[PDB]
């Protein structure tokens, strides 16, 4: 059962790793968007 538990652990760890990498790419994309975005009043004045 130890090989079963190790395989289950490493597969759920790699799946969580891939999904967290996708979430982090979403987060860094949103960070770059909110960095490169002036608010409403700036562009409304412009």
């Amino acid at each position: 059962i130890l090989n079963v538990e190790a395989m289950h652990t490493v597969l759920r760890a790699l799946k969580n790793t891939a999904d967290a990498m996708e979430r982090g790419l979403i987060h860094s994309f949103l960070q770059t968007l909110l960095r490169k975005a002036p608010p409403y009043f700036v562009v409304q004045t412009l």
């Binding site: 979430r23 979403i26 987060h27 949103l30 960070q31 909110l34």
Partner: protein, 49 residues
């Protein structure tokens, strides 16, 4: 740079809105951030003096 993404499409459901010939996607991000450890960067702190 626009030579990327040809011949690849799929249908998917997400809500649109109609604002004077401008059709805009509307989408919130609680589903990507519930049970997480980082605060969502749309939750901002703003200072006022």
């Amino acid at each position: 740079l626009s030579q990327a993404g040809a011949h690849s499409l799929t249908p998917l459901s997400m809500d649109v809105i109609r604002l004077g010939e401008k059709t805009v996607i509307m989408e919130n991000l609680r589903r990507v951030y519930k049970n997480t450890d980082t605060k969502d960067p749309l939750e901002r702190n703003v200072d006022l003096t």
